[PDB]
């Protein structure tokens, strides 16, 4: 299996700062690198496929960019609606994998 | 426009098979791509499989064959079926399209003796 | 559009298909040279009522909806017209979904008849990409 590595595990910030968030893979997965957000209480919401495809529906201060096996998802001017728990998920290969994750919370 | 929704026990006694069930409305679950999905304690999340448009199923190895996901097209509902659960399956499980862009809304399910 | 071989090779290897799914590069381009001979504006008309749009030629009865083709089921939740662009990332996008099923590479006929069981790493060879 392709392991998916995240950092930082937890990440503090001040409400309008930016931050960027990573990802790392065992192998490379080209562009199959995928982004979600769980909030308290909640299902995973998609927000980036495809390393840098947007979605229709989510705010566009997210923003996502890599390939191979360095990956990241920037966030332009945290809202308080942005905190919660961040993974990264590939498909290029099966058992799909998800990163251990990063919690944003408020500085 | 698609709906999910989970059902089942919230409780199960160790080596029975938990069963669960999806049902979908605003599209027919035949032959749509549907998964399953758990979150451990400690946010770790573990796809588990998919059923496909020819009615193929990918499962997790970490699961060592002990599940099984099955559709019925009459009632527009897709199942969940493990087998011999322990401890280490105590988990929020979800129901999600292949897509990845509708979700249920999650059930949590203890597996103890009791 | 009608790409090169090289070109083609390259593009796709940006949008993530070497190695998808265990298909390697080569399946690609031996398909879509077979499917459309590297035409993203390239259709078929069949014989059931659904038509094949672009480069990989998706079908209009079950991955993209063109309005036109009965039992449309748009697998792919995509208009077909959406794949008759140069751009290929829509194409790709459905093409990911497709060979995620069981069949795999299978739904593509010219590539069963054409691809599969010959040397494919000879179609990304003599290339920079």
Redesign the interface.
């Given at each position: 299996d392709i392991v998916l590595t995240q950092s930082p595990a937890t990440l503090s910030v001040t409400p309008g700062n930016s931050v960027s968030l990573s990802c790392r893979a065992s192998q490379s997965i080209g562009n199959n690198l995928h982004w979600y957000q769980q909030k308290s209480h909640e299902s995973p919401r998609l927000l980036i496929k495809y390393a840098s495809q947007s979605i229709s529906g989510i705010p566009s201060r997210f923003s996502g960019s890599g390939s191979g096996t360095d990956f990241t998802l920037s966030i332009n001017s945290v809202e308080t609606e942005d905190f919660g728990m961040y993974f990264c998920q590939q498909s290029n290969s099966w058992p799909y994998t998800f990163g251990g994750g990063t919690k944003l919370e408020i500085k | 426009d698609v709906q999910l929704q989970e059902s089942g026990p919230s409780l199960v006694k160790p080596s029975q098979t938990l069963s669960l069930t999806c049902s979908v409305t605003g599209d027919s679950i035949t032959?749509?791509?549907w998964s399953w999905?758990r979150k451990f304690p400690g946010?770790?999340?573990?796809?588990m499989g998919?059923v496909?448009?020819?009615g193929?199923?990918?499962y997790?190895?970490?699961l060592k064959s002990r599940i099984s996901i099955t559709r019925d097209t009459s009632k527009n509902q897709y199942y969940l079926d493990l087998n011999s659960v322990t401890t280490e399956d105590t988990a929020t499980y979800?129901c999600?399209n292949?897509?990845?862009?509708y979700?249920?809304?999650?059930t949590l399910v203890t597996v103890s003796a009791a | 559009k009608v790409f090169g071989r090289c070109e083609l090779a390259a593009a796709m290897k940006r949008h993530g298909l070497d190695n998808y799914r265990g298909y390697s590069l080569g399946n690609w381009v031996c398909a879509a040279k077979f499917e459309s001979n590297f035409n993203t504006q390239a259709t078929n008309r069949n014989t059931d009522g659904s038509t094949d749009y672009g480069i990989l030629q998706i079908n209009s009865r079950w991955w993209c909806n063109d309005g036109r083709t009965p039992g449309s089921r748009n697998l792919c939740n995509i208009p077909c017209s959406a794949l008759l662009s140069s751009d290929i990332t829509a194409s790709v996008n459905c093409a990911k979904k497709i060979v995620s099923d069981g069949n795999g590479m299978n739904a593509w006929v010219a590539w069963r008849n054409r691809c599969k069981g010959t040397d494919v790493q000879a179609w990304i060879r003599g290339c920079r990409l």
């Open positions: - | 032959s749509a791509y999905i946010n770790r999340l573990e796809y998919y496909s448009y020819s193929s199923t990918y997790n190895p970490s979800y999600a292949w897509d990845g862009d979700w249920g809304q999650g | -």
